[PDB]
């Protein structure tokens, strides 16, 4: 449900537009609980999740 | 087999180029370095045939070179490529921006005589324009890895935008650590001093990876870095800290002068 | 009204975002700075509604300052967007690296109480990484517009990859004329001399724009660039002069040294 | 032309036909000999017979 939504709303412009004017509303309608629109308004990333990125270094 | 190595961008989704999106979905194999759990999940519903290269990470407080890590990785790619794969590395941002992996591929792969390319991407650099509304044309741009400042001589030009990359694990040269500490950041604070007022305002950045997330873009004193919260995937931006002067030397030999500037 | 700048990369169809692609096909109008007319046919195909803003450059042999180019340009974009249009431009490549037009649009639609953001693209930097196969993190990385490095103090670091911009009119201060001269190339290699050796060798690179086209890669030396054939989408490479050299000041602060480097 | 390398540019398994017989892909999508002797001689203005944005 909330890893469908996050693919569509990143994927699809008319979505993404609609999102920008309403956010509480186009999270709802897509299903989304209150505890992750708290996080996405609150921006807890880490509260939604519920890795190492680093490909180089600097030693030559 | 035959290895093409492409770049999703940050952004979940919506930020692979067309071309790569498609080379991913007629893949034979997929070996990925993607930022997040999401972002794993886009990918294996395009492919369902991957790998996940974060295996290959110090696990259970391991210590671990990270020469060992990347070496590791590009032997899991060429197995598959020997072995007759259509092979296909997506790596989050640019594939070859400041990631090894791909270049390292790439070359050992044509050198045992295999097609091997790697398609362009969107890289954090690339993203920090955007959000921050930043021509990097406006007064030149200059990016280094944070530690390779560090340990080696660079002269930065103060009257461009530089970039430290990597500035999370400044100062940490034995490649086993996540994170460094607050005595190197100073360190480096000092250093930067040469050409930086320590009141020099700089800019911490991360590009959201997430539709929903918004970037961080925190401002503060060059002072009080050693303090700032970072994470692996902040970007340090510093702002000129000179404007630019003419040069009449040249100028005189191109027989014109300020005013005559269209 | 709002305003969206995207770009469509270098390569004919493939290299734009998933996103951006959308944006274009979501618009009620699109103003675009394509390469060429493959790619117009593209954007034609994809939104019937385009203004092109080729137009407002200088016709017939006329002269024309770039700024009053530019200018007329974002009063274009801003006139739909006044008017109420969903607006999206469509640049090539980056809409914000090394274009001033896209910043000062947004710049401008924010003023008045518009929407406006810029969606980060595949640049030629980002294609010269992948067809020359460098890491921009290597040893590091610089990038200058070629006139304003003449015109103004700019001190490159001879141990990163250097690149100059917009090489075809390096020198070319009246902003009327396509192309510069070889007199202002040899005032160029003259001025570089004093970092880099005459023999020291360059590369001259042209990201293709067809899939059908290869890049260009010509390498030659310094001291040949007067008389090579440049176009307006050349950029010049200047690869390390000086391979990197321990920090010893630093390491000392570290309490290391070169032997303790993981 | 134009339709043929709108496709070859966005699809992968075009894209990788093409590499592995550029002359048979291209005559297999109608291109004339004229057509693939600019391809292959690398003559992009006789394909267009068949960019500055900021200052210093
Ligand atoms: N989301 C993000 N925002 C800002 N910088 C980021 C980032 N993700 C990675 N980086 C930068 O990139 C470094 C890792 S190196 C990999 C970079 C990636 N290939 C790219 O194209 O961006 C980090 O230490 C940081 O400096
Ligand atoms: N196909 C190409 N190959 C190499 N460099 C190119 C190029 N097209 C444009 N450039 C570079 O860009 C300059 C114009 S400024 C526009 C750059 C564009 N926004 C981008 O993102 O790349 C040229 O003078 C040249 O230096
Ligand atoms: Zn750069």
Same mark, same amino acid.
């Given at each position: 449900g909330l890893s469908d939504f996050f693919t569509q709303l990143g994927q699809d412009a008319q979505l993404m537009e609609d999102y920008k004017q309403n956010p509480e509303a186009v999270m709802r309608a897509h299903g989304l609980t209150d505890e992750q629109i708290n996080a996405v308004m609150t921006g807890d990333m880490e509260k939604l999740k519920t890795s190492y990125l680093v490909i180089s270094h600097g030693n030559g | 087999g035959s290895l093409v190595c492409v770049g999703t961008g940050l952004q979940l989704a919506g930020q692979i180029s067309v071309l790569s999106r498609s080379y991913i979905e007629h893949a034979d194999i997929v070996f990925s370095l993607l930022p997040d759990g999401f972002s794993q999940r886009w990918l294996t519903k395009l492919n369902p045939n991957v790998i996940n290269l974060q295996q290959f990470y110090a696990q259970n407080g391991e210590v671990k070179n990270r020469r060992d890590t990347y070496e590791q990785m590009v032997n899991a790619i060429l197995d598959a490529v020997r072995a007759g794969k259509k092979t296909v590395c997506a790596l989050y941002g640019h594939p070859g921006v400041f990631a090894c992996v791909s270049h390292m591929a790439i070359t050992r792969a044509k050198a045992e005589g295999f097609s091997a390319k790697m398609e362009p991407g969107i890289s954090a650099e690339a993203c920090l324009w955007a959000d921050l509304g930043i021509d990097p044309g406006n007064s030149g741009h200059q990016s280094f890895e944070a530690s390779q400042?560090?340990?080696?001589?660079?002269?930065?030009?103060?009257?461009?935008?530089?970039?430290?990359?990597?500035?999370?694990?400044?100062?940490?040269?034995?490649?086993?650590?996540?994170?460094?500490?607050?005595?190197?950041?100073?360190?480096?604070?000092?250093?930067?001093?040469?050409?930086?007022?320590?009141?020099?305002?700089?800019?911490?950045?991360?590009? %959201?990876?997430?539709?929903?997330?918004?970037?961080?873009?925190?401002?503060?004193?060059? %002072?009080?870095?050693?303090?700032?919260?970072?994470?692996?995937?902040?970007?340090?931006?510093?702002?000129? %800290?000179?404007?630019?002067?003419?040069?009449?030397?040249?100028? %005189?030999?191109?027989?014109?002068?300020?005013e005559d500037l269209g």
């Open positions: - | 400042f560090m340990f080696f001589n660079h002269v930065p030009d103060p009257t461009t935008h530089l970039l430290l990359w990597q500035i999370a694990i400044a100062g940490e040269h034995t490649l086993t650590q996540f994170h460094t500490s607050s005595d190197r950041l100073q360190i480096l604070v000092e250093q930067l001093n040469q050409w930086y007022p320590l009141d020099h305002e700089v800019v911490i950045y991360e590009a %959201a990876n997430l539709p929903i997330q918004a970037p961080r873009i925190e401002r503060l004193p060059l %002072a009080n870095l050693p303090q700032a919260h970072l994470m692996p995937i902040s970007t340090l931006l510093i702002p000129p %800290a000179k404007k630019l002067e003419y040069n009449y030397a040249i100028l %005189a030999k191109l027989g014109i002068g300020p």
